[PDB]
Amino acid sequence: LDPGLQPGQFSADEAGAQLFAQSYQSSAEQVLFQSVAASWAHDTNITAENARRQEEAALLSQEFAEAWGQKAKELYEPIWQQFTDPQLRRIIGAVRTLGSANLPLAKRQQYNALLSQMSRIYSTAKVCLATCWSLDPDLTNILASSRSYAMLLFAWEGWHNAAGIPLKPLYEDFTALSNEAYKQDGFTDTGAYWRSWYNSPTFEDDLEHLYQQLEPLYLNLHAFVRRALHRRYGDRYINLRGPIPAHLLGDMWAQSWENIYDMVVPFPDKPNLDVTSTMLQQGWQATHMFRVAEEFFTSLELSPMPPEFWEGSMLEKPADGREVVCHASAWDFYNRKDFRIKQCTRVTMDQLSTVHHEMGHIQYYLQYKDLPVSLRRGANPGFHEAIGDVLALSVSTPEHLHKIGLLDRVTNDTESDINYLLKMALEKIAFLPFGYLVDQWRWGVFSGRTPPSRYNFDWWYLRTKYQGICPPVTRNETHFDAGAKFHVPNVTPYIRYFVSFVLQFQFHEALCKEAGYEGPLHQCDIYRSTKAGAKLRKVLRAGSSRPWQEVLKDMVGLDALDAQPLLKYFQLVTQWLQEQNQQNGEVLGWPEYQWHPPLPDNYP
Ligand SMILES: *[C@@H]1O[C@H](CO[C@@H]2O[C@@H](C)[C@@H](O)[C@@H](O)[C@@H]2O)[C@@H](O[C@@H]2O[C@H](CO)[C@@H](O[C@@H]3O[C@H](CO)[C@@H](O)[C@H](O)[C@@H]3O)[C@H](O)[C@H]2NC(C)=O)[C@H](O)[C@H]1NC(C)=O
Ligand SMILES: C[C@H](N[C@H](C(=O)O)[C@@H]1CCCN1C(=O)[C@@H](N)Cc1ccccc1)C(=O)N1CCC[C@H]1C(=O)O
Ligand SMILES: *[C@@H]1O[C@H](CO)[C@@H](O)[C@H](O)[C@H]1NC(C)=O
Ligand SMILES: *[C@@H]1O[C@H](CO)[C@@H](O)[C@H](O)[C@H]1NC(C)=O
Ligand SMILES: [Cl-]
Numbered sequence: 001l002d003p004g005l006q007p008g009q010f011s012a013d014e015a016g017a018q019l020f021a022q023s024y025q026s027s028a029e030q031v032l033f034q035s036v037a038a039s040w041a042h043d044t045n046i047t048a049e050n051a052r053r054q055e056e057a058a059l060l061s062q063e064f065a066e067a068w069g070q071k072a073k074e075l076y077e078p079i080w081q082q083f084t085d086p087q088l089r090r091i092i093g094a095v096r097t098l099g100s101a102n103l104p105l106a107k108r109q110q111y112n113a114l115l116s117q118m119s120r121i122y123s124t125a126k127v128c129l130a131t132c133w134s135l136d137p138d139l140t141n142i143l144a145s146s147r148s149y150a151m152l153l154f155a156w157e158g159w160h161n162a163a164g165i166p167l168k169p170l171y172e173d174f175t176a177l178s179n180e181a182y183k184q185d186g187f188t189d190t191g192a193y194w195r196s197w198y199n200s201p202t203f204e205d206d207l208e209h210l211y212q213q214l215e216p217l218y219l220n221l222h223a224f225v226r227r228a229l230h231r232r233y234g235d236r237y238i239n240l241r242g243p244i245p246a247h248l249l250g251d252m253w254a255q256s257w258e259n260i261y262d263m264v265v266p267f268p269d270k271p272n273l274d275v276t277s278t279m280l281q282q283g284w285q286a287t288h289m290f291r292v293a294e295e296f297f298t299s300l301e302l303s304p305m306p307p308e309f310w311e312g313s314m315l316e317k318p319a320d321g322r323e324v325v326c327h328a329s330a331w332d333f334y335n336r337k338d339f340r341i342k343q344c345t346r347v348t349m350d351q352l353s354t355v356h357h358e359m360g361h362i363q364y365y366l367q368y369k370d371l372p373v374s375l376r377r378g379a380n381p382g383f384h385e386a387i388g389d390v391l392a393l394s395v396s397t398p399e400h401l402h403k404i405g406l407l408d409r410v411t412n413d414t415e416s417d418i419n420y421l422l423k424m425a426l427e428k429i430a431f432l433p434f435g436y437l438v439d440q441w442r443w444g445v446f447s448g449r450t451p452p453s454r455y456n457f458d459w460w461y462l463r464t465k466y467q468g469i470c471p472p473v474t475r476n477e478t479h480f481d482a483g484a485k486f487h488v489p490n491v492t493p494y495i496r497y498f499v500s501f502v503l504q505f506q507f508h509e510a511l512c513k514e515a516g517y518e519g520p521l522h523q524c525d526i527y528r529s530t531k532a533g534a535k536l537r538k539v540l541r542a543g544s545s546r547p548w549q550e551v552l553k554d555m556v557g558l559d560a561l562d563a564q565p566l567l568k569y570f571q572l573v574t575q576w577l578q579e580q581n582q583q584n585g586e587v588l589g590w591p592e593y594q595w596h597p598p599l600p601d602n603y604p
């Protein structure tokens with residue numbers, strides 16, 4: 001570690017801890033920079049040479065984290081927990097937490113190489129027919145707009161096999177090294193470490209109580225969609241009393257169902273709320289999408305994207321054939337100057353949502369950039385995930401789409417509302433089970449409840465239990481279907497997205513009230529509300545400097561996650577779906593839990 005980056009001396013008491021903490025933050029900033037820069041260079045240009053520089057940068061970060069962590073342990077291990085300053089308890093008590101820096105060098109190298117090879121496998125996997133389809137855009141477009149059972153099967157099976165199978169051995173090794181590292185910081189396993197970010201001793205119980213209030217909405221949406229699929233694919237491929245085949249829902253993970261909107265839309269005579277075809281008709285490109293997102297943020301008197309954002313970002317899949325990580329992501333370089341998005345943007349309405357989602361992360365980074373590095377975080381991870389989604393709730397309203405030239409006719413009647421809420425439920429309610437289940441899987445794996453010999457059996461257990469989907473071809477433990485989802489090989493926690501999906505409705509409700517809006521919550525558009533903007537800005541400017549419970553309470557008036565705002569937003573279509581399911585004699589749920597569809601006669 002460079003001499004300039006190493007800790008000096010400080011006194012073994014609270015006032016010393018203060019000086020410790022201040023010089024700690026001041027050095028970390030340069031180490032963060034080199035690390036994220038090496039990641040950028042690799043993720044926008046996947047090469048063996050870039051992966052090596054990235055691994056070298058991560059080793060440097062670990063050496064830094066070891067030297068400062070050990071120092072914090074030498075001075076303060078027996079005394080930081082009774083420190084009078086709460087913030088210091090934690091700008092600090094993080095530092096006593098070495099993570100992978102607890103591993104000896106050989107294992108640090110092995111860990112860092114695993115992350116890099118897992119990322120590379122996921123991002124370079126292809127499905128071969130021999131010309132080859134990538135996840136983004138090729139397989140994505142197939143899952144989105146093909147209606148051919150056999151083609152969807154080909155893409156689903158191809159992807160799961162290509163990404164998942166080679167990841168499995170690496171993932172097992174990763175898991176063991178991760179646990180070994182976090183266990184030396186006093187956690188029972190890595191998932192306990194991940195859960196501790198919520199600083200909530202009843203987190204798991206609280207989540208389960210949330211899920212119980214939301215599950216009926218999901219069950220009704222599921223039965224109605226299942227019937228709409230049955231009408232198209234027939235009695236052989238759809239069981240009205242069984243799980244839905246996992247490839248027929250418009251998305252590789254069945255996690256968002258908005259792409260099958262045209263098959264379930266109750267009132268097709270009303271304005272078509274999927275504006276993708278109008279975006280194409282009009283010549284929208286990636287850069288327009290980012291500009292339109294940006295202008296929503298400035299209408300609230302939040303910050304525009306800086307020059308360095310426009311110069312540095314990767315907003316389209318490169319055409320020079322270069323290999324890139326296509327999964328959309330938002331980047332803070334920790335130098336208070338460079339922030340970027342890397343997205344292989346496609347011109348679709350759900351991509352416009354993703355753009356807002358990503359830009360929400362940038363906005364948070366811009367607002368908190370002057371805080372100590374350790375406090376440059378969301379109040380909890382779910383907060384970072386909710387910012388852009390909140391704005392996207394206003395964006396997607398018919399009234400707002402009309403304002404931006406994407407919906408000619410505006411209607412305000414109960415059928416239009418059902419079509420709108422149904423579309424929003426396909427995006428938001430369908431996701432809830434998947435949001436909750438992914439980290440349940442990973443928590444069981446890190447705790448050892450799910451050994452490698454049950455990785456796929458426990459995955460599909462949870463997939464069926466919560467989502468009520470089934471794999472469209474037989475799977476076995478050679479398959480590693482969880483590794484076919486980005487966040488698993490990329491080692492990014494998932495529960496934040498479940499938290500986000502609930503909290504965004506609480507924020508939306510608060511910002512709508514602050515904007516002086518007085519009609520149904522699902523019609524609210526906070527566009528141009530500088531009062532809504534100021535309230536959002538107070539949250540963004542806080543970073544992680546105060547407990548999330550108190551940031552939440554200031555913003556929305558309650559200090560907990562609460563399903564009530566989402567229920568209230570959805571209440572008209574909740575009641576309509578229950579009435580429709582009842583009139584159609586649907587069975588809620590999937591009591592034929594063992595059913596799987598047959599293979600097509602000529603498969604593949
Ligand atoms: C779409 O339409 C709804 C419904 O509008 C109401 O019902 C229709 C059938 C017609 O009778 C309309 O003339 C009628 O307004 C609109 O929602 C309604 O907005 C008004 C004001 O914009 C709300 O009234 C407010 O109520 C608060 C107390 O809650 C009072 O402080 C105020 O005096 C204020 O007038 C009204 O409650 C609200 N109705 C519902 C269903 O909540 C909606 O605004 C309109 N939206 C769009 C996008 O055009
Ligand atoms: C497309 C969206 N992409 C992610 C994302 O932006 O979250 C990317 C990839 C994983 C995290 N991520 C980032 O960019 C992070 N830099 C965000 C962040 C993490 C910690 C602290 C601050 C900021 C996503 O996966 N999503 C979106 C909602 C559903 C979920 C999915 O597609 O599975
Ligand atoms: C990609 O990385 C290599 C080194 O791995 C570098 O020589 C090359 O210029 C990069 N290409 C682009 C277009 O960034
Ligand atoms: C798992 O499934 C594949 C494809 O159907 C098959 O090749 C394999 O032998 C199966 N069994 C095991 C133990 O992998
Ligand atoms: Cl998280």
Ligand SMILES: [Zn+2]
Nearest residue numbers: 357361384385
């Ligand atoms: Zn995000």
